[PDB]
Amino acid sequence: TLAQRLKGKEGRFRGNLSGKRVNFSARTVISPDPMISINEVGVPLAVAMELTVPEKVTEFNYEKLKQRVLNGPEKYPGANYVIDPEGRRIRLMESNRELIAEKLDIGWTVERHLEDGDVVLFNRQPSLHRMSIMAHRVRVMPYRTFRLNLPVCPPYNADFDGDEMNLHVPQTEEAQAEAKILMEVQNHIISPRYGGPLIAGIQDHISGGYLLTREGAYFTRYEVEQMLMFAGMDVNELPEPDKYENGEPLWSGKTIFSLLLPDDLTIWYRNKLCDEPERCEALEKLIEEKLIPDPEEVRKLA
Amino acid sequence: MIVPVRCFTCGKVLADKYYEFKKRVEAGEDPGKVLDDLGVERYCCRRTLLSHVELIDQVMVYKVY
Amino acid sequence: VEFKILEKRPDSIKFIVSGVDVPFANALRRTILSEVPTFAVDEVEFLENDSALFDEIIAHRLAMIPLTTPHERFSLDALELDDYTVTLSLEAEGPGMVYSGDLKSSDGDVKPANPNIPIVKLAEGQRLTFNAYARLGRGKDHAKWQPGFVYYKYLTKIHVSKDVPDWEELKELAERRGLPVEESDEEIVITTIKAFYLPRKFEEHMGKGIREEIVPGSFVFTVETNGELPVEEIVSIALKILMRKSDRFINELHKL
Amino acid sequence: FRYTRFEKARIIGARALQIAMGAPVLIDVPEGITPLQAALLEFEKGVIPITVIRPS
Amino acid sequence: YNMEDAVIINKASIERGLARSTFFRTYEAEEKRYLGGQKDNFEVPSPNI
Amino acid sequence: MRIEVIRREENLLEFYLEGEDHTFANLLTETLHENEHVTFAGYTIEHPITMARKPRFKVVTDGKITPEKALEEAAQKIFDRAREVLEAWKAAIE
Amino acid sequence: DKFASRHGQKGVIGLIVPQEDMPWTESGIVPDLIVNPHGIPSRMTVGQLIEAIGGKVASLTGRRVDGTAFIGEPEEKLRKELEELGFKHSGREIMYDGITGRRLEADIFIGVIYYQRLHHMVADKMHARSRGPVQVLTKQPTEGRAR
Amino acid sequence: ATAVYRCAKCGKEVELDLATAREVRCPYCGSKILYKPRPRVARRVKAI
Ligand SMILES: [Mg+2]
Ligand SMILES: [Zn+2]
Numbered sequence A: 001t002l003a004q005r006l007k008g009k010e011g012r013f014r015g016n017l018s019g020k021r022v023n024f025s026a027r028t029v030i031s032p033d034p035m036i037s038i039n040e041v042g043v044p045l046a047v048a049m050e051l052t053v054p055e056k057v058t059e060f061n062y063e064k065l066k067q068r069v070l071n072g073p074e075k076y077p078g079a080n081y082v083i084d085p086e087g088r089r090i091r092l093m094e095s096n097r098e099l100i101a102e103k104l105d106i107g108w109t110v111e112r113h114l115e116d117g118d119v120v121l122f123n124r125q126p127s128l129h130r131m132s133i134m135a136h137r138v139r140v141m142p143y144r145t146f147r148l149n150l151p152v153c154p155p156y157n158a159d160f161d162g163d164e165m166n167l168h169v170p171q172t173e174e175a176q177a178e179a180k181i182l183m184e185v186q187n188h189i190i191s192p193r194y195g196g197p198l199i200a201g202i203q204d205h206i207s208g209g210y211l212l213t214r215e216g217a218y219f220t221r222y223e224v225e226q227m228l229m230f231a232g233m234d235v236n237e238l239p240e241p242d243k244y245e246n247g248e249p250l251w252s253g254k255t256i257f258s259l260l261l262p263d264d265l266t267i268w269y270r271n272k273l274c275d276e277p278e279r280c281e282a283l284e285k286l287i288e289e290k291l292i293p294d295p296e297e298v299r300k301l302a
Numbered sequence B: 001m002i003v004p005v006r007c008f009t010c011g012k013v014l015a016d017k018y019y020e021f022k023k024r025v026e027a028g029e030d031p032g033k034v035l036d037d038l039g040v041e042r043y044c045c046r047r048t049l050l051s052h053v054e055l056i057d058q059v060m061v062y063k064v065y
Numbered sequence C: 001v002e003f004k005i006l007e008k009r010p011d012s013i014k015f016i017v018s019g020v021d022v023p024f025a026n027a028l029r030r031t032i033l034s035e036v037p038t039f040a041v042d043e044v045e046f047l048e049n050d051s052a053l054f055d056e057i058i059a060h061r062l063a064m065i066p067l068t069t070p071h072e073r074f075s076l077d078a079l080e081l082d083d084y085t086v087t088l089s090l091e092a093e094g095p096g097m098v099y100s101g102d103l104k105s106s107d108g109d110v111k112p113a114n115p116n117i118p119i120v121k122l123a124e125g126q127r128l129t130f131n132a133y134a135r136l137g138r139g140k141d142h143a144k145w146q147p148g149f150v151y152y153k154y155l156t157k158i159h160v161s162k163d164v165p166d167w168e169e170l171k172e173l174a175e176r177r178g179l180p181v182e183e184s185d186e187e188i189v190i191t192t193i194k195a196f197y198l199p200r201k202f203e204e205h206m207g208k209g210i211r212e213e214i215v216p217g218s219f220v221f222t223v224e225t226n227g228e229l230p231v232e233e234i235v236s237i238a239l240k241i242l243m244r245k246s247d248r249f250i251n252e253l254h255k256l
Numbered sequence D: 001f002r003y004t005r006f007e008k009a010r011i012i013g014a015r016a017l018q019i020a021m022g023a024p025v026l027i028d029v030p031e032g033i034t035p036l037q038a039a040l041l042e043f044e045k046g047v048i049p050i051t052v053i054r055p056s
Numbered sequence E: 001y002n003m004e005d006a007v008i009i010n011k012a013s014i015e016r017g018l019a020r021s022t023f024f025r026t027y028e029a030e031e032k033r034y035l036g037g038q039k040d041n042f043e044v045p046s047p048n049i
Numbered sequence F: 001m002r003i004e005v006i007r008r009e010e011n012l013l014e015f016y017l018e019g020e021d022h023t024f025a026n027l028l029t030e031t032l033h034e035n036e037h038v039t040f041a042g043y044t045i046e047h048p049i050t051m052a053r054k055p056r057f058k059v060v061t062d063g064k065i066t067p068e069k070a071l072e073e074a075a076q077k078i079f080d081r082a083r084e085v086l087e088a089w090k091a092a093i094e
Numbered sequence G: 001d002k003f004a005s006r007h008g009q010k011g012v013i014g015l016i017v018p019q020e021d022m023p024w025t026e027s028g029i030v031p032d033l034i035v036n037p038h039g040i041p042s043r044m045t046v047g048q049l050i051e052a053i054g055g056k057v058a059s060l061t062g063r064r065v066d067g068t069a070f071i072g073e074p075e076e077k078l079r080k081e082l083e084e085l086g087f088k089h090s091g092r093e094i095m096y097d098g099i100t101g102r103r104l105e106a107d108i109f110i111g112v113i114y115y116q117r118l119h120h121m122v123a124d125k126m127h128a129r130s131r132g133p134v135q136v137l138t139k140q141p142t143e144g145r146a147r
Numbered sequence H: 001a002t003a004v005y006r007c008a009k010c011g012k013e014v015e016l017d018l019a020t021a022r023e024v025r026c027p028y029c030g031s032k033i034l035y036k037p038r039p040r041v042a043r044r045v046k047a048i
């Protein structure tokens, strides 16, 4: 009766008022994608052509929205619905696709397909903390599954053993702005729970960093150029090679790692690979005296 | 239910020699030598031939029309 | 560039390439794997199908059937393939087994290479009739268009010092595995034309007792065909494809 | 004086809502961006007219 | 791309029929009879309805 | 084949090569590495799904020759090497 | 698409890598699957490695390898026959990169592992709703994917 | 709107009109389950 309708987990207060099903949302499996940024989410083409962003026709996006209307719902990038300034919503079919496009003017609203750079919410359940949902950028790929960057996985507590994730598309401009400014991914790298890094490298990132930066790790010119191109670094010219082996130049992995760090960065600490404290103590003492130790002196007892 | 035409790894054709391999196996010979004499040297093709089990004969009996 | 042929069989060739670097060998292997075009069943029109296998399964099995490619008529080295369609019509009635040799090809030179490939078993009252349309395609789009398999390994020489215990066991194992072995007064050299792995007892000598050197610019290539093309013509077709790609890149650079 | 994240988000949302139904852009546009991007460039150029009322 | 329990599959292996599966779904329709002799009819509906 | 220039400098050339894969990309990059006038020669694939057929190349020379000339020389060297290998292969069987 | 081993190792397909880009061993074997090395020791899954060794041995010899509990073929015996077959005891093989074409500096462990596809396919799990039917009571979107 | 159907057990062709069928069954063997035969219109299936 009414009391059971109001109370309980399935009641109106919890199942219909505090939390309720929403429109313009998708949900599917996630797969890894290191090739995209932490700000980007892999949106399938089928999902993108279904979820629509309502964009008002202005003086600067009139041509783009006209092209979206002229493409239609079956062509990407296209549109699904058109709302006139008075407020009648018309679904775009093949017959009226050109007629509505010719009738487009300033003040009209076009529910266009999801495009690159669009801001959407990416949430995984259960949402134990405020970092369980972040606003990503839409990246459209022709496959079926969602794609999320690996460093963003620890915030979501999500692996790729059949994990299901939801995506929410804000409709109003205020909601899109709020998602872009507040709940953007890069704005939530540090976890407020403990004041430490949450969006961070894991597993293969740590292993590759150790393999690159370990002692005796050297790479050829072709390998260095290939990794520089793969990482998307703006290194126009190769640095001076550290040593020559068999007549060919070799670059230390520390030299390649140094290009990532800013030029005015200086920090020293001890990692988990410490099992000879004598060398660490000597390095700390050498840093303590001069406060600007010579790079040759550091490399002698590195 | 039926033997694949090509090996899943390299695309080497194995359906031609599967029935000869099955007949020689039922005769009591060592399947390794049977695979060796049939040209099945890579263990991926050997995987495809050995792990396959014929089941189409049990599906043909159930008519569908 | 020196070419030395090790083994030739009507379906495979193992040889040694010298004078080329690692990128060229990798490019040749990838061109053979994915760029060399062959004839494979691309579309299937079904008239009757009462077998246990579905239409998709039968179509996929037909696509896996190797078809002979007439490389003389069709310029397989062209970057754009000819839009020629070959129709293979089958109309069989059960009971029995449908083989690849029962297909009636519309072109004499475009026929299944292996006529003993089973397709489906037909029971009493079951009949299968279809027309399979085949066209030229590359292995980079689907695995049905691959001319076969290709791989290569580094031509490495393994030097085993006579001071290493039980070196005669390694020598006789290499001789049994068909590897060229040379014997000197101080060490034995084994040419690894195939995959050679040292046993566990010789693992402790891999640093100072037994050494492995890589011959600069020499590789051992093994290319096997399924009958679509002659195994000698696949390498030539791949090299001509690489030449055409280089010419097209030069033309694009000139246009730019 | 500095803008908080909530204040900046509110300003950008209000500006984007204004641009969607009027309010011509005070700066140049890349001819195809969304009104949210227009508000973002307006904020980046320091040309926004919307202020924040703070209790005192 | 195999990170965090993920796996990487071969395109040629998939195209060769490895792990290929077919999914069957069965739908049912009943010509139910209602009170007063009314019953469903199995026919192509007219556009006028 | 198509060449789409993204960024061009006084000695730098960055371009997408549509319709090509890792094969010709790696071959061209290593052939450019064989040239002593090319200070930097690299290629990458930004995504193995969306743009797996559109590698991106960056070629920076020392200023002695233009990057386009270096790329043309690398392509000509690839063509000559492929022709030599083809002739050797034909002579091996015949 | 969800694929799982018999030892609790499960995951979705991350990439459909072409054969030309996949690595290959010195024996000419291209793997049909590639798994991350980080998952093997964290979950203490040595049975997967033993099954890979046994599958390689069974494929090379032609005789099926018994994997029964407490009465199965010993691991050391399997490594012994793998050594006698001309392969490394550990199951590692020298592999070449499919893109660069160069030899990998580490011997990669490759073997035959029974992997099963599960019914949690991405085709039946993708849901995308923009607008449509609503509940007659709360005027809210309906439940599930079928409606 | 009569049509031909295939029996599940005997497999012989069964002819009846589903629009005005008082009872649908195979008169040859008494089977009450029938199969709709596949049409002879050519269908095109993509090879993988
Ligand atoms: Mg999970
Ligand atoms: Zn194989």
Ligand SMILES: [Zn+2]
Pocket: H007, H008, H009, H010, H011, H012, H026, H027, H028, H029, H030, H031
């Ligand atoms: Zn009957």
